[PDB]
Amino acid sequence: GQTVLPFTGIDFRLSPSGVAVDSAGNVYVTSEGMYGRVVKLAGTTVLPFNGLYQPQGLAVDGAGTVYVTDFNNRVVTLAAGSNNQTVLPFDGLNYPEGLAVDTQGAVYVADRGNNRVVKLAAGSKTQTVLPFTGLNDPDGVAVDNSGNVYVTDTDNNRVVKLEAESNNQVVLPFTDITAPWGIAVDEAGTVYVTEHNTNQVVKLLAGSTTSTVLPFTGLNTPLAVAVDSDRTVYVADRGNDRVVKLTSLEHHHH
């Protein structure tokens, strides 16, 4: 049932490390590589970020601002239709991977080299380190509408939720999760994760005790995942230089 998104007119291998989807259903991908790019499928274009070096993760907020991590160890943002990027004041990032943006503009980064997740509130000049414990190469972060934060503890083969109320770390009941990397949370609290070296994508329903394997086929190193308002799931299928899409919408009287 999946489809491959038709990125056309492109002079470089797509190398998709990250994937985000805005309200209009524009799809954005970080194209890894020495000369990093963010590519936007509507036709296809390239956003005027300058000097991206191996960009690893992206997110798009409700205003259409695109936020990107890269291996210059920073987060760059581009406001919709701007051609002037700004570098957010994160400190000490070491191989930032996935990032997330919550409804108040706060930016969260899986800081893989420091085995932590860092937070920067909107307009603040200093970051916070979130109270996770025992992380080993976190690659992916997601934040729900309830301020719960979710991380892929990659080398621990687990996903941890820092609950907004208790500030407790819960190892979410994924079933046999391996080397989880990409993650997203949809508006129903459902958590999607890529198991990146085992080439599956799994989901966990909010408040549920176990998980399921989404019916993707032919994945090769899925490193990110997004989900739109139709609860369509998009995957950065990194080894295949493509993004694949899987719709969840029900079929009338079938």
UniProtKB/Swiss-Prot annotation:
PTM: Autophosphorylated. Dephosphorylated by PstP.
Nucleotide-binding listed as a keyword: yes
Key words of the record: ATP-binding, Cell membrane, Kinase, Membrane, Nucleotide-binding, Phosphoprotein, Repeat, Serine/threonine-protein kinase, Transferase, Transmembrane, Transmembrane helix, Virulence
Extracellular side stretches: 1-248
Keyword Repeat: yes
Biological-process GO terms, alphabetical: regulation of primary metabolic process
Cellular component terms per the entry's GO annotation: plasma membrane
UniProt NHL repeat ranges: 2-42, 43-81, 82-123, 124-165, 166-207, 208-248
Single GO MF descriptor: protein serine kinase activity
Places the protein is found: Cell membrane
Residues making up the signal peptide according to the UniProt record: none
Disruption phenotype: Mutants display defective invasion and reduced survival in brain endothelia.
Family, as annotated: Belongs to the protein kinase superfamily. Ser/Thr protein kinase family.
Task of the protein: Part of a signaling pathway that enables adaptation to osmotic stress through cell wall remodeling and virulence factor production.
Subunit structure: Homodimer. The extracellular domain interacts with host laminin.
Protein name: Serine/threonine-protein kinase PknD
Species of provenance: Mycobacterium tuberculosis (strain CDC 1551 / Oshkosh)
Residues of the full protein shown: 413 to 664 of 664
